């Protein structure tokens, strides 16, 4: 694989360069939101983000070396984790709020507009706060997001993926040694970061169930793409 030959710095730049763009929501400024309108906005947004995510994934070193089915598997497994960690990342500089889009910055209580959504918002807000207090860097973020993509579905399938996973770990450590962190601080921070991935998994699974309910509740028509990504988890 080509990913394994890449240096740590080369890996960081490759990931940084693959970053998807920050998309906008609709400019209709009518407030407050209803359930259907907020649901519509969120699902519309995720729909458009998903397209860019696939572009991003194909540019994650090592991901192209996988068969199409493996790529499909990993993305179907990890797509909401990846949306959420991006959401949480974007929201870092907006404490108490979720920056879904630059023109869609939502506080905690706006989660109440959709039933069962405020619980998901609180988990995301707590994750963003955690990132804030850890002073999560963009280079660390993109490393974590790639880890999710490669790791979350790898046990529902190996060596190639796991070698790349090892490569990102190396890259993560390289970034921390770069910031002047001591050896003890290096593995301690590594651990702290990877443990948050367990909570991101939890949030995704909570979000997946909520999305499924909204599908059954039929509050808003979901796109074929989003439905298919959702169908993969049932």
């Amino acid at each position: 694989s080509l990913a394994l030959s890449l240096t740590a710095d080369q890996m960081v730049s490759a990931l940084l360069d693959a970053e998807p763009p920050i998309l906008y929501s609709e400019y209709d400024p009518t407030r407050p939101f209803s359930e259907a309108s907020m649901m519509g906005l969120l699902t519309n947004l995720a729909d458009r983000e998903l397209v860019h995510m696939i572009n991003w994934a194909k540019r994650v070193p090592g991901f192209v070396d996988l068969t199409l089915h493996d790529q499909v598997h990993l993305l179907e497994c990890a797509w909401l984790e990846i949306l959420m960690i991006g959401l949480v990342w974007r929201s870092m500089e907006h404490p108490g709020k979720l920056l879904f889009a630059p023109n869609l910055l939502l506080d905690r209580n706006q989660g109440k507009c959709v039933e069962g959504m405020v619980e998901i918002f609180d988990m995301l807000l707590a994750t963003s706060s955690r990132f804030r207090m850890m002073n999560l860097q963009g280079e660390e973020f993109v490393c974590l997001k790639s880890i999710i993509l490669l790791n979350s579905g790898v046990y529902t399938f190996k060596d190639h993926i796991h070698r790349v996973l090892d490569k990102i770990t190396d890259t993560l450590i390289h970034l921390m040694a770069k910031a002047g962190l001591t050896l003890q601080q290096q593995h301690q921070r590594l651990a702290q970061l990877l443990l948050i991935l367990s909570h991101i998994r939890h949030m995704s699974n909570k979000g997946m169930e909520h999305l499924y309910s909204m599908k059954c509740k039929n509050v808003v028509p979901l796109s074929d793409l989003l439905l298919e990504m959702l169908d993969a988890h049932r």
């Binding site: 397209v51 696939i54 994934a57 194909k58 199409l68 790529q71 499909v72 993305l75 179907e76 074929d224 793409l225 298919e228 990504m229």
Partner: peptide, 11 residues
Amino acid sequence: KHKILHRLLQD
């Protein structure tokens, strides 16, 4: 099977 994801990944 047909998958919108297949198209997006191949494109």
